[PDB]
Structure formats: structure tokens, C-alpha cells
Amino acid sequence: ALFKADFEDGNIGNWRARGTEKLEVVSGIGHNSNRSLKTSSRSETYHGPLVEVLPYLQKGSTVHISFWAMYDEGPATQVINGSLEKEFNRDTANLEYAMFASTTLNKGQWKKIEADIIVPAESTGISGLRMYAETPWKQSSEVTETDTIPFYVDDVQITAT
């Protein structure tokens, strides 16, 4: 257990939006629990909840990341992805993005999204590594309402391997 967020304290902590979307810790909705992190007012597929995790981790290591997701409005099914945003040498114009996992969710049902990931070594100059959830990429002109549904995440966990 290197990092855990279950939201049961009601705290947003260091979670943040990627763009103009809205994050809220809600009560009465959670994965086998009363609280979770809702992302709404999404207007791009890449809007979604993000948190910096590099400080929790040993550079060079392999770790297992998992989280639970759920959505409860719009289409009968929808894909959610779990991804990493990486920064090197504090260069914010050349961020890297890598999807680590994706699953099809059924409306109203919690599902686990997980994978092993690699934490780059110190000598790479890695300066940020953030996990985030999103829907599959579409260019801004092609985005539809089903792509920008609000969704919940909960029980975010990173474990040693």
C-alpha cells in the first residue's frame, strides 16, 4: 500500500482537474463505501480526475495501480481509461501520456481498472508522474455528449510488486 485514496474523510487532497471540469468529493455514492470523487462539467474526452503520485513512489520501480470507476447517466455502456501523465526536467510543454488500462463499464456498476506500471529512474530527470482517468480520445470537433459524461472514481491504490 504506497498510495491509497478512498475519499472517506471527504477530502479532495491533491486531486485536480486537467482543464475546466469540476471535481467534488460526494457522499452517498461510493464503491462499497459512502464517498467517492466525482468529475463533472467535462467538455473534452481528456477531462478527468488527476493526481500526482511520483512523490509516493521509488524511481525505477514497478508498481501496481488500480482504481474503481462508475458512471450513472447517458449511454448503456461507456469505456473509461486509466492513464499516466509524465513530466521530465520540469518541461511542461513536452508532457507524455500513456494509457495503462481501459475497460467497458455498464451504466450504474462499479468496475476495477488496473495494471502494472514502471516508474522511470532518477537519471531520466522525471519530475512528475500523475495518474488520471478519462474517456477515449476524440478530437474537439468530433466530441459528443456520451464522450463527456460525468463519472466517479474510488479506491485508488498503488501497491509494490
Binding site for Ca ion (CB under 5 A): 6-7, 30, 33, 35, 154
Q: At its nearest, how many Å lie between Ca ion and the CB of residue 36?
A: 5
Q: Taking the complex as a whole, how short is the minimal distance between the CB of residue 66 and Ca ion, in angstroms?
A: 13
Query: Is the Cβ–Cβ distance between 113 and 80 less than 8 Å?
Result: yes
CB of 69 to Ca ion, least distance (A): 12
The closest residue (CB) to Ca ion is 33
Of 49 and 86, nearer to Ca ion (C-beta) is 49
Minimum separation from the CB atom of position 154 to Ca ion (A): 4
Give 24 or 116: the residue with its C-beta nearer to Ca ion.
24
Please, which residues have CB within 8 angstroms of residue 76's CB and are 6 or more apart in sequence? Answer: 106, 107
In the complex with Ca ion, the residue whose CB is nearer, 27 or 106, is 27
Nearest residue (CB) to Ca ion, 126 versus 133: 133
Report the alpha-carbon distance of residue 105 to residue 67 in Å, rounded.
13
